[PDB]
Amino acid sequence: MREIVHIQGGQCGNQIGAKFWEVISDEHGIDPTGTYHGDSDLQLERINVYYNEATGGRYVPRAILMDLEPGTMDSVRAGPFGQLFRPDNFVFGQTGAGNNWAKGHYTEGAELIDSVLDVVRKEAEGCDCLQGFQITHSLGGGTGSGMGTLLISKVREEYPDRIMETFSVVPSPKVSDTVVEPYNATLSVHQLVENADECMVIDNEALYDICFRTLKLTTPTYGDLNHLVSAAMSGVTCCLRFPGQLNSDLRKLAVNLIPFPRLHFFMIGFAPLTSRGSQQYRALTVPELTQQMFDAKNMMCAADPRHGRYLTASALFRGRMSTKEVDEQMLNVQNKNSSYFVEWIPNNIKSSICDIPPKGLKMAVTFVGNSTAIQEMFKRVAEQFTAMFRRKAFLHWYTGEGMDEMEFTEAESNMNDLVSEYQQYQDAT
């Protein structure tokens, strides 16, 4: 039915989806136990395309658990809504990748892929007209990417028609949570540029910036952050989940978002984002949220539209309004800062609306535009990879996995090729 599935690895991402399904449960108001306690059939109408009824009305996720060590499995296993799960999917590891990506990709990569792809495949038979599935990990290591690389390869072959919308955490330029990041990252991204269908960037520092400045929060954790992102990743299917006077699916999205298949790394904007007092400063209009939409500070990725140029831009609106406003602000904005709008893409802004906003708010905005400002991102990470690969720093942890360096060259001149590729598209008219 255009239903989809979720698969998460990732040192964080395993938590991320926990929050995610948590949020969707709220938007479906079904008890933690797994039965519905809401007030409209509309939550039940399209419930299946994420959930699954069970005998007795156990309502369940179409999620897939990735992990190389059960702790997360216990963690979310210790999770509220944990009784809303299926024990089947608790597919984890006994070792952990140690985030040498070769470890999580050959060593443990080849070790535990099979049981996953089997049960996942059983989910594939459980899906009537599968629009797709949602993967989640991080692009700097192996706790997610280790195996998730193998996932994208295997299912991608196994389902060359299905959509692969991939969110994985990008290392911020400043803070290096690990120094093996350039290598895991580069080795992964070689794969992901080939095999993944959609990708959107996952920085932490942006999420900090949001929580601290625009959220005006002092105490950052993951969980709030995954609230902030699963807000958007939860919004994305809204029309696909719920009616909309102007609907567009991921196929309409990506096909209406990408000129050439190498450009499915997208940046993200969601809003509104206030602290409590703000409403008693300000109110909500479509033009208002628009005035956030093109905010670099909501630009939750390491790329700057202020520095790069919008190759593409789009808006995901959930609520009840007048599109006569919506479009009007659209075109207005597409003029107002025309210069950061790439040229030969006429009407490079594109529209949407969901008859219902997310719960709690009256109107919704989402922006997954695609400039080319990410070039500094790949340039950076490739740069650090370059330095220590001059040094071969921690190659020994690496070659101990029994990869070659020439692969590193492959993702290397590879990833540079993708960058310059974005250069010419940005530098053209």
Added chain:
Amino acid sequence: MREIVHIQGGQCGNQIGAKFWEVISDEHGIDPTGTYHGDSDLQLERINVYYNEATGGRYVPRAILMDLEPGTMDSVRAGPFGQLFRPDNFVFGQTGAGNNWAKGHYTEGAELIDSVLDVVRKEAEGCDCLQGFQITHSLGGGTGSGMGTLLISKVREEYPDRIMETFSVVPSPKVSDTVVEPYNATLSVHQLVENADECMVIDNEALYDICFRTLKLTTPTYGDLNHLVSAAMSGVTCCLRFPGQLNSDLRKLAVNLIPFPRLHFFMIGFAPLTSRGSQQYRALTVPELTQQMFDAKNMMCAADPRHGRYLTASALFRGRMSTKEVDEQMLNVQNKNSSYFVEWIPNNIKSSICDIPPKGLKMAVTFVGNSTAIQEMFKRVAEQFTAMFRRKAFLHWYTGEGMDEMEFTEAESNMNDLVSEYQQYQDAT
């Protein structure tokens, strides 16, 4: 009335039938005492074809006890439902076979067959239109097979029209509970290929695998296992015991299962099999249980359909459903993995349904298909027999029984002949 009897020997099998009749009692809800305490006449309608009313309504089994040492006779004699028995049938031995099969077949074989076949024959007069009888032992020794070989010969001659559906325990390839197994086994199987009408394979390691992985149990015993198997062997007569919109008896089964009489070694699948939490992961559909039906892990035998090819396949369904589903999944599956379906057997899958499932569950599945993957089974056991028969290891325990070795050659090139026989049928089109 197509009523039948049971005969059990076997170091375990004597326990097995204990559990079996125990289970049937539950499905007939008659007290241990031997009177009915149930709620539908339907349990009484076809009760006779396993049971026997007695003066005063003592309801009794048509079972036959085999043993060469009374301990089991005391054991089940110490059995709950033990007051549901007839003291007559407690026909045992004073020696034990020591599992030299010649001991249990000539020595004690010829010693105690007579009293058995007499009283059994008295049961034969007790049977109006005997569909058959159920034998049980193991195919590696003599505690069952010792005499059960003589049973199959004697009654087979004595009743050349009756069905002989034979379940006996197969030694798993890994764990050798005794090393004289190849010899007892081979000597038996020579007989059983000639004389037995139906056979289904009885491994232990599969039952472990079921209990530990798919049952998710840590503590294996026999008794649970016999629960797992007497579940199926109890299902088999359901239509024969109870109405069914699509009924098929053992004659319809075997005649609808076997191309040539040498192929009545069949593998088995029964389901569902969960631990308690599973229902709160999943629910029951015909397509679901189907999705277990072709599971190698439910393939409770040493043969792999994943390695061999389904010469035949069948489904035993008890419950209340829509056959419109049933068939649909049938044909669907007969395509989906066509390659493991032998070719010139069109519609090599075949159907059934019982208006009632077993007690406690709403729908029932059973699979007794017949690939030819067992070739590795006979090849193994014949191989070990080959090695120590090169050595004549424990021939002295053996020839001390006063058999010849040429018999060993007979079952030897015999059993190899049966294997290669399955090779050509598997290797043909």
Added chain:
Amino acid sequence: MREVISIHVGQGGIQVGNACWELFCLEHGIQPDGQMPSDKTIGGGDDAFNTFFSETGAGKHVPRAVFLDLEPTVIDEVRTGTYRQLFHPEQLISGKEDAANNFARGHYTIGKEIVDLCLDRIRKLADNCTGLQGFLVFNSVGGGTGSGLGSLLLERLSVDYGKKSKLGFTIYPSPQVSTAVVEPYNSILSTHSLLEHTDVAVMLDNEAIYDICRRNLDIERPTYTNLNRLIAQVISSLTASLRFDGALNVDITEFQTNLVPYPRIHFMLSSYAPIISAEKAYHEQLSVAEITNSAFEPANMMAKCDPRHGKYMACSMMYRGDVVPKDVNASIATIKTKRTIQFVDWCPTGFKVGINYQPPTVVPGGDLAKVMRAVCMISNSTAIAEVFSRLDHKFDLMYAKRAFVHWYVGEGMEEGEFSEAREDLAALEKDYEEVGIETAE
């Protein structure tokens, strides 16, 4: 005066029968015990129930049909069921040990066991009857006696009376859906011994019942209840003329050498309509033209053999209810009009109208919606030979591999029965091969 009687065999077969007599008894509304709710007024002009429901000296009106099958479990359910006041003990003959789907068993082996009881019952009814036209015989190539024992049954019953009509309802192996694999053996062994003991008979396949009940009845999950209900309707209307006033109360014997012009290829299709839902009963009008044009939808074809791949020969669109000779008539012009359809031209038109004035009655708890008009397209074309060819090719190889043959050779049949019966379908393949040839010049 105008009697027929029904015979029931094979698991699905007597399932059909149960549905049927449930039906007719519903339709004359005589209560299940054997009484009508009220007294019957004395009148003339035509028969009534008297065809099948059996007059007593009181409110006891039992069918004129007979059960025979060697798998006696299920029939007991009738022996237990609500109609245990309806039926009659001597109406009931069953075998204990059925064929195991050995054709040769209940045909040969157990064939010997119950025949005489059957014939005696037949003599009791036909002796009880006067103007019994023909014989309603139901069985199945699956519930194995439905093939074997029925094969002897007509094999001898024909030689008993002969002059009665053979009304043949049996099921045919669904093209890709099935029940077993010896079905080739059951079928073809039946067929060479079927034909020359058969007058004419139709081939009901199930998969159509499924697909059409699920789309046209809007059925989600059907079974033999729905199937048996559906065949219940079709037979319910195939004989209304002898039960109810219609403009052209055509008759079976009338149908015989006119629908099946030659002697040989004397079977046919039957796509009844209008089968729709209560939500399509409304949101629709269900014209004579809708039933009529709809009657020839190959996708409506109630046996999985494409009419468009064949060339029609005859079509007896007997109609229930408020039918107009003219309106249907012009629809038949419309049927001449259909370019895609092609007819055994040496039989240019062979049509034969049926306009019975009673529109259909519905069975409560059923899925079909209520209408005003019924169609039965008992039609015969060239198309149906093909699935036969599948049967003889499938059976061809399997028999070539000698599969299962031990089962049958064990029970007293010879191999030349097999190869020769394959010559039988060879000949019939020559028949559908030849009659479809357009006569030269």
Added chain:
Amino acid sequence: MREVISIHVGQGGIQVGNACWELFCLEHGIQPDGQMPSDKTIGGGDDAFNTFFSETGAGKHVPRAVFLDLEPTVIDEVRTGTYRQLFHPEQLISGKEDAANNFARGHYTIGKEIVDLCLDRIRKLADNCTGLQGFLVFNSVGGGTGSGLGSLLLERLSVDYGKKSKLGFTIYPSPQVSTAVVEPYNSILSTHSLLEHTDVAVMLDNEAIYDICRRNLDIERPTYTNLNRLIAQVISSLTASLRFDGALNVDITEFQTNLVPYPRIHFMLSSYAPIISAEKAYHEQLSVAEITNSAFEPANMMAKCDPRHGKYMACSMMYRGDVVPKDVNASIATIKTKRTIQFVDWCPTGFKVGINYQPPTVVPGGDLAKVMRAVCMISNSTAIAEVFSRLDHKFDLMYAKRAFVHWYVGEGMEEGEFSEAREDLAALEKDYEEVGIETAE
């Protein structure tokens, strides 16, 4: 006798359809279930609803229109909505996975998936109909099936009947406002496959709907409810002749080769009025001359293409209500009078009056005020080629950059379809280029 039927596609498109049948059902006032509030008296002289609302044997009068689109969510809202008694299940055909606005997908890829079901439904209705003049087909160059699958739809339906009229309502990419960017691809790929499968059709753009509803309806914040309402009015009047007495009950086929004199450039504008408020319904009088002179306001032009930049060819000012032949007539002199307007002089006048006597009916909850007289200026000029030229230049560059082309090439279209379709708009640019040339001497 005089039938038409509506087809609905694309998100906005079936939005339009929903508004429409809401409308007509309101206007004949037959209650949403399918019944009229009261019995219908037997009379003659002209048809009624019978055109579109479908007679049952009872108060069940369903439209004669069909839904088809591969994005099946929203249509379910009709499947749920109040008119779930109105419509009919088999009236409903949808696709699950829509085109993703791949023209080539629901045109090629999913194009293959639902066509036959569509054609069968069409045969059921047209067979249900008798004097069906033409075909109401609605879709959109946005809700992607509205381009692709509709493209096959007429592509084959035309080849089915042909002799029916093609009544084309589809939306055109607003000049600067939009929905996507592949719109060039959708449109032009549609167009070269649109023209020779189209008879005639009009181009509704939205931005006019906005600007005019906000000024003329005094609308503050509109959406597809208002839009769909507005097109609801315009189609409501474009066919009144077949529904209501008018002095010159002109007809579609009548319109065909007379409005669009040549075969090629057979599209047009349509500025309906009088759309005003309740506070302008009062504070005004709304003369025939006001609607008439007002009818040619370029700023009133209901599709964002300046008439004053073009030269008119025909104008079918069909009128609702109390119209005077004379008064309008002199207004038409006034239209000859307009110096700024310039006509395809070789067609000096091509006018064609429409005076239907029923003034308009209003939809409660609507924004339009009530009046006495309606105008539809279905007129054709030279002007409309330009925005096309924008379309082929925009698409020109974007296609030059091969943007998105992987999406379409991935689904089974060839590049020469692209460049050649650009030759198509090349030719039509020669057509608006040439027909606007004033014939020499």
